[PDB]
């Protein structure tokens, strides 16, 4: 068993929008690299935690106070699911 890396179609759109809105993409890249490299658990600054409701099975890390990464992590997969504001991702 080797864990894969996945990106939802929506994730790619979300990343393009973050770029367009002048977010500091290096901050998202750093977080993604920690996950990809299995340098886990993440440090406390990300406030990483599991989600419920429609996002049950996924996790929530804060890149910034209003910039969230939603991802799934199992033994088999790491999937980057969405990124953006809390309102966009949860509202």
UniProtKB/Swiss-Prot annotation:
It holds the Pfam family YafQ_toxin. The keyword Cell cycle does not apply. Disulfide bonds: none annotated. One of its GO terms (biological process) is single-species biofilm formation. Toxic component of a type II toxin-antitoxin (TA) system. A sequence-specific mRNA endoribonuclease that inhibits translation elongation and induces bacterial stasis. Cleavage occurs between the second and third residue of the Lys codon followed by a G or A (5'AAA(G/A)3'), is reading-frame dependent and occurs within the 5' end of most mRNAs. Ribosome-binding confers the sequence specificity and reading frame-dependence. When overexpressed in liquid media YafQ partially inhibits protein synthesis, with a reduction in growth rate and colony growth rate. Cell death governed by the MazE-MazF and DinJ-YafQ TA systems seems to play a role in biofilm formation. Belongs to the RelE toxin family. YafQ subfamily. Monomer in the absence of antitoxin. Forms a heterotetramer with antitoxin DinJ, with 2 YafQ-DinJ dimers associated via the N-terminus of the DinJ antitoxins (YafQ-(DinJ)2-YafQ). In this complex the toxin activity is inhibited. Binds the 70S ribosome via the 50S ribosomal subunit. NCBIfam families: RelE_StbE, YafQ family addiction module toxin. This is mRNA interferase toxin YafQ. It comes from Escherichia coli (strain K12). The gene is yafQ.
